[PDB]
Design a protein around this ligand. Structure first.
Ligand SMILES: CC(=O)N[C@H]1[C@H](O[C@@H]2[C@@H](OC[C@H]3O[C@H](O)[C@@H](O)[C@@H](O[C@H]4O[C@H](CO)[C@@H](O)[C@H](O)[C@@H]4O[C@@H]4O[C@H](CO)[C@@H](O)[C@H](O)[C@H]4NC(C)=O)[C@@H]3O)O[C@H](CO)[C@@H](O)[C@@H]2O)O[C@H](CO)[C@@H](O)[C@@H]1O
Ligand SMILES: CC(=O)N[C@H]1[C@H](O[C@@H]2[C@@H](OC[C@H]3O[C@H](O)[C@@H](O)[C@@H](O[C@H]4O[C@H](CO)[C@@H](O)[C@H](O)[C@@H]4O[C@@H]4O[C@H](CO)[C@@H](O)[C@H](O)[C@H]4NC(C)=O)[C@@H]3O)O[C@H](CO)[C@@H](O)[C@@H]2O)O[C@H](CO)[C@@H](O)[C@@H]1O
Ligand SMILES: CC(=O)N[C@H]1[C@H](O[C@@H]2[C@@H](OC[C@H]3O[C@H](O)[C@@H](O)[C@@H](O[C@H]4O[C@H](CO)[C@@H](O)[C@H](O)[C@@H]4O[C@@H]4O[C@H](CO)[C@@H](O)[C@H](O)[C@H]4NC(C)=O)[C@@H]3O)O[C@H](CO)[C@@H](O)[C@@H]2O)O[C@H](CO)[C@@H](O)[C@@H]1O
Ligand SMILES: CC(=O)N[C@H]1[C@H](O[C@@H]2[C@@H](OC[C@H]3O[C@H](O)[C@@H](O)[C@@H](O[C@H]4O[C@H](CO)[C@@H](O)[C@H](O)[C@@H]4O[C@@H]4O[C@H](CO)[C@@H](O)[C@H](O)[C@H]4NC(C)=O)[C@@H]3O)O[C@H](CO)[C@@H](O)[C@@H]2O)O[C@H](CO)[C@@H](O)[C@@H]1O
Ligand SMILES: CC(=O)N[C@H]1[C@H](O[C@@H]2[C@@H](OC[C@H]3O[C@H](O)[C@@H](O)[C@@H](O[C@H]4O[C@H](CO)[C@@H](O)[C@H](O)[C@@H]4O[C@@H]4O[C@H](CO)[C@@H](O)[C@H](O)[C@H]4NC(C)=O)[C@@H]3O)O[C@H](CO)[C@@H](O)[C@@H]2O)O[C@H](CO)[C@@H](O)[C@@H]1O
Ligand SMILES: [Ca+2]
Ligand SMILES: [Ca+2]
Ligand SMILES: [Ca+2]
Ligand SMILES: [Ca+2]
Ligand SMILES: [Ca+2]
Ligand SMILES: [Ca+2]
Ligand SMILES: [Ca+2]
Ligand SMILES: [Ca+2]
Ligand SMILES: [Ca+2]
Ligand SMILES: [Ca+2]
Ligand SMILES: [Ca+2]
Ligand SMILES: [Ca+2]
Ligand SMILES: [Ca+2]
Ligand SMILES: [Ca+2]
Ligand SMILES: [Ca+2]
Ligand SMILES: [Ca+2]
Ligand SMILES: [Ca+2]
Ligand SMILES: [Ca+2]
Ligand SMILES: [Ca+2]
Ligand SMILES: [Ca+2]
Ligand SMILES: [Ca+2]
Ligand SMILES: [Ca+2]
Ligand SMILES: [Ca+2]
Ligand SMILES: [Ca+2]
Ligand SMILES: [Ca+2]
Ligand SMILES: [Ca+2]
Ligand SMILES: [Ca+2]
Ligand SMILES: [Ca+2]
Ligand SMILES: [Ca+2]
Ligand SMILES: [Ca+2]
Lengths: 128, 128, 127, 128, 128, 128, 128, 132, 128, 128
């Protein structure tokens, strides 16, 4: 079903890292094992993820950014951020303070931060 | 050198679990991948391990216990607890309050706790 | 992918100086081309860089120091030195003999040395 | 032969201050009377000077430093420190502990210390 | 103000000798440069001087003796020992043991000692 | 006069090892052939030995330590380290960094290091 | 209130030894009378001790060390060194020159010296 | 001789008080005035090292007498003195960012952070030691 | 009503310390201010107190112990431990593990611990 | 054999005070521990005691005075002072200057000083 020590959720497998890497570095790592920097597809999936971070209080990268075009948030799979996800941003976010182009789970919601900072991350890939 | 996302350290590879299991279920968990509930061999390893645990703010099992003979602490690989390690016990520990036969990393040093408790754990195995 | 004559490794481009500068002037220099005195983020990157220095038979500065607080090493970007990386110090280091607050690649590992010395250096910057 | 209260020794005059100034300030204080922070030119001079300090147990500055080039000790008159003077350093000196660039008479030999500290000093100049 | 390396205090310059001489050679010494073996006036001057020597860990002569009249103490110039000053003698002085007719600074107070002994001295003179 | 491939110098035979052992092992190793971890008795000897080390730039053990009394360097034959040998320590040595109680030829002089570290060594015995 | 000859100070009794022992032996010594190598816990107390030591002109051990982790000072009762207490180190201390892992009252402040040295010591324990 | 009042901390000629209650920046300033003290104005690196650690070990965010209230971007101590360039290294990474308008300084972990002045936080009072 | 920075609660003034001392050093501390190391008299008081420590998550001393008579817990004011309060100990407490004769607030309840350990403390006294 | 921190020397145990008491008060102090202010009975003993006061440079009382009969020295136990010992007085002692009727170890020998002065002291008694 899911690789050793990965967590199963609705037909998908997730891996909450223990190391901290910058955003692009997080991507090549999920790459190595055939997974993707978690792209959130549904409210249910988001609650589950947000809880994985919330419960351990770790800042975690997700596969969402506005690197290509400031203000225009897009998932690593290319799908644009849906208006129905705005609610997930923490108050005042995304504020792009000092140029923040990457989304992370922070507190009970999301925050945009500098993509060069080292954070925990989550990989995702289809279950067996 | 090491399996994906394991930490390489002085000839060995270490894995910090994301899940929490009681002591015994951890032992069997490490076997599933040809590893073992961490057994500390050197002072240098203790410093490394203790710090990683402390940094992660997580209580973590180590492959040590006095289950077989109260007061007598023995590693899972058989080797006995040397006197040069007794120093790593937290102040007052081991206390066996409520009958604690398994060892964990607690803050600055070691602590004995109930084996039935689910905690994070660490697997160890030699590098390639 | 990488500026002219820079090496490309796991998403980043490293530059091995041919000049020798003191630790500080080695930082100001990577700042002249939007680069940073190499900060080792992973073990594989450490192995790569160690090999680079070792085979060139050169003593080279990395972006690490304990100038701010003796005995507490920090990378030039603020990040702290992880517990696992301490295995890279050469046997006996860091010893601070003669007051050493800057790190370098020496043989198979790291060594603290006087920051006033001119050594080779390595810049780093994302692809 | 020597200014009132100065001391004579081998065609030269020496002034042992009763006040304590930092290294650089000791240097200017000597020029004020056309003298130079003691630059040692011979073994006998060293014995004599070292003895002017041991008798009173006073840590005293001399015209020697490595301020310009760490580890490169040179006298104020610009001449380099001779390998034959290596023997005067106290055991373990110079050790630049916390950055020490100025030499002083300490105990039976020399020690390097912080140039900004106040110490006694000795001026030297030719006798009439 | 004061000459090169002479300490200043209440409109007067004081010189702490680097050499030791007997009481008489000391007076003559101060006269060489038209000065006098320090004669105290105030109580601060005393506190000042007593400190100047207590610090330098040196027994120092002063212009006070009972040479011309055992039991009767007069200053080099002519003034006499005042009842207020008599509190400055250390516990149990002057004792005149072995015939002591000259006063020196000793620890926190004064002591009478043999005038033939070579000790450090202090000259005094008019400021600017 | 001397064994095969040993060096002769002023009535003595010297053997530069090929292996690297800790300090005590080097000691026991020299006895197995009736020699001794080199104890230096004269300046000429010291220059001869230092050269045998400088040539190939190899760190080498000598029968000298301060294991018994820190700061008190003693040769293994029992004789104390004469003050006239002080000049042989490299600059800043002996510094006991991390507790170094064994002496080795290092570069152009001597240095103290950890006795548990394996290095080359030299044996001494009189000629035939 | 206090055993014979011990000194009372703010609820506790202190014993200044007349004998000199190395750090460790000093620790055991205090234990034989149910006391402990003085662990300072207040500015007023630090002043009390620094004075006794200073005035008695004796270098004295206190129950403080960085033997466990270089650069990290800890009292023998396991407690850590408070931030405000770093002001008590003599200028330039701690320097660890020659490898110094034990604290001693030295003059106006504290200095780290080699634990193998014999020095005087101070025991502490509560009054009655 | 008690260089400092009961339960106050003596450090290099001064007395310090780590509060147990939380107050907005202004209420803290006034609070220290009650006992003849002042919201901690830092004068040296060592004082800074001392205070930063006290704050960290206590796991509490704590106000210091510094702000850019009167002039955004320009920081000043409550005693009129300006923020010397040598103290800029003390700001945490990315700070002061002024997010949501922040004009008051606090001890946050390893360094300094600007936060909203109305927030209730612990604070530290300072004043010189007694005559003795 | 209450002293500066002290907390008011139904006719009583309480002081939460930021310093940590052993049980006795705390008693003598509340004495310096005519205060008493807190003695609970009511349940509303207890709930209010447990909260102080509960929120700041701090181990805190109280004037309660079984020092005089192991097993017999008596407040510092003399009063006994009403069978009513008993409900406050945490499961398994007091276990007197390794001889614990002092009470402190721990988590949601109480626990006995070693009187020699340094914890935060609370003073108390009637409001003027 | 000897009390804690007491020195053993041929059958007896001696104590060196850290406190300074007048001669009488020094007598009552030794009685309190069933001891007597050191009364020398042999040469060796004396040689050993002089060193004790010689190292520390402390003026130390001994059980010897000529109070009841000026010029006639007797030990506190009664046994009059023998001649052999009289070779221990320092030059010019006893000089009964200002009327001194108590012996003290001073420098390399003995001296008579005022009994009302506070000085260090030694107690004595056999072992077991
Ligand atoms: C501030 C800090 O260093 N934080 C670190 C943290 O450090 C540890 C942490 O421990 C807090 C408590 O965590 C759990 O509740 C327990 O481990 C508890 O210990 C007691 O209870 C366990 C059972 O749950 C016993 O096994 C253990 O021996 C101990 O027993 C109690 O002992 C006392 C005194 O001897 C006795 O009187 C009690 O009766 C007894 N209690 C019971 C139930 O029998 C911990 O107290 O904080 C401590 C400082 O306050 C540290 O010393 C701990 O090491 O560690 C994490 C993870 O490493 C780190 O992220 C954090 O920074
Ligand atoms: C054999 C090999 O792999 N060759 C590699 C080479 O490897 C390194 C090389 O180092 C030789 C010496 O090079 C310089 O002189 C120094 O780095 C020196 O180190 C000492 O001195 C510096 C200061 O100059 C200190 O920072 C350093 O800590 C060390 O100090 C000494 O430390 C000991 C404790 O062990 C102490 O006892 C001494 O008192 C203290 N001395 C002083 C003056 O304070 C080097 O030793 O060879 C070593 C093996 O012999 C290797 O371990 C080194 O890694 O590296 C180059 C560059 O990559 C490569 O070209 C070559 O092939
Ligand atoms: C501790 C301190 O403050 N250190 C100060 C230091 O303090 C003084 C120091 O003096 C110690 C001895 O120094 C010399 O040896 C003498 O001054 C000696 O005094 C005796 O001998 C001289 C003769 O040279 C006499 O002039 C003097 O009166 C005394 O005679 C003796 O008097 C007693 C009466 O009580 C009588 O019983 C004896 O028979 C007689 N003996 C002789 C030889 O005649 C000093 O004792 O330490 C003392 C404490 O032990 C202090 O009290 C002294 O002030 O002073 C220096 C100088 O400034 C300072 O730097 C240092 O810090
Ligand atoms: C006037 C006064 O204060 N008198 C006090 C006296 O004060 C102290 C005294 O110290 C003198 C020396 O005493 C010992 O020899 C040592 O403590 C020495 O310190 C150096 O060496 C030790 C190791 O032996 C080191 O631990 C120490 O850090 C220091 O190391 C040297 O440090 C310098 C940098 O500062 C460095 O350049 C050297 O390389 C290094 N030396 C070595 C070998 O590594 C003392 O200096 O006098 C000093 C006057 O300046 C005071 O500052 C001292 O506090 O204390 C006594 C006892 O309480 C008191 O009675 C007296 O009144
Ligand atoms: C792990 C550790 O060191 N623990 C220390 C702890 O360290 C500090 C702690 O901070 C956690 C968060 O605490 C508060 O929520 C805030 O201070 C928050 O900072 C953000 O929010 C405040 C306002 O709420 C802003 O003023 C501040 O600038 C920051 O803003 C955010 O900034 C990012 C850019 O970096 C931007 O993208 C966001 O949009 C923006 N958010 C908002 C709401 O505007 C803290 O993050 O842990 C941090 C490490 O994760 C440390 O850096 C902190 O120093 O400190 C305590 C107390 O000293 C200590 O006990 C503990 O050991
Ligand atoms: Ca952008
Ligand atoms: Ca952006
Ligand atoms: Ca943001
Ligand atoms: Ca059991
Ligand atoms: Ca058990
Ligand atoms: Ca336990
Ligand atoms: Ca440094
Ligand atoms: Ca350093
Ligand atoms: Ca080094
Ligand atoms: Ca320098
Ligand atoms: Ca230098
Ligand atoms: Ca030095
Ligand atoms: Ca006369
Ligand atoms: Ca006279
Ligand atoms: Ca006299
Ligand atoms: Ca040693
Ligand atoms: Ca050594
Ligand atoms: Ca060395
Ligand atoms: Ca050490
Ligand atoms: Ca140390
Ligand atoms: Ca030191
Ligand atoms: Ca603003
Ligand atoms: Ca602002
Ligand atoms: Ca901020
Ligand atoms: Ca009990
Ligand atoms: Ca109990
Ligand atoms: Ca308990
Ligand atoms: Ca008489
Ligand atoms: Ca008499
Ligand atoms: Ca006398």
């Amino acid at each position: 079903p899911c690789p050793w020590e990965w967590t199963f959720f609705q037909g998908n497998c997730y891996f909450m890292s223990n190391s901290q890497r910058n955003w692009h570095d997080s991507i090549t790592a999920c790459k190595e094992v055939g997974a993707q920097l978690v792209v959130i597809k549904s409210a249910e999936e988001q609650n589950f993820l947000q809880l994985q971070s919330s419960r351990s209080n770790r800042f975690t990268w997700m596969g969402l950014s506005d690197l290509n075009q400031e203000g225009t948030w897009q998932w690593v799979d290319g799908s644009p951020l849906l208006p129905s996800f705005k609610q997930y941003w923490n108050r005042g976010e995304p504020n792009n303070v000092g140029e923040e182009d990457c989304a992370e789970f922070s507190g009970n919601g999301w925050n945009d931060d500098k993509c060069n900072l080292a954070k925990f991350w989550i990989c995702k890939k289809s279950a067996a």
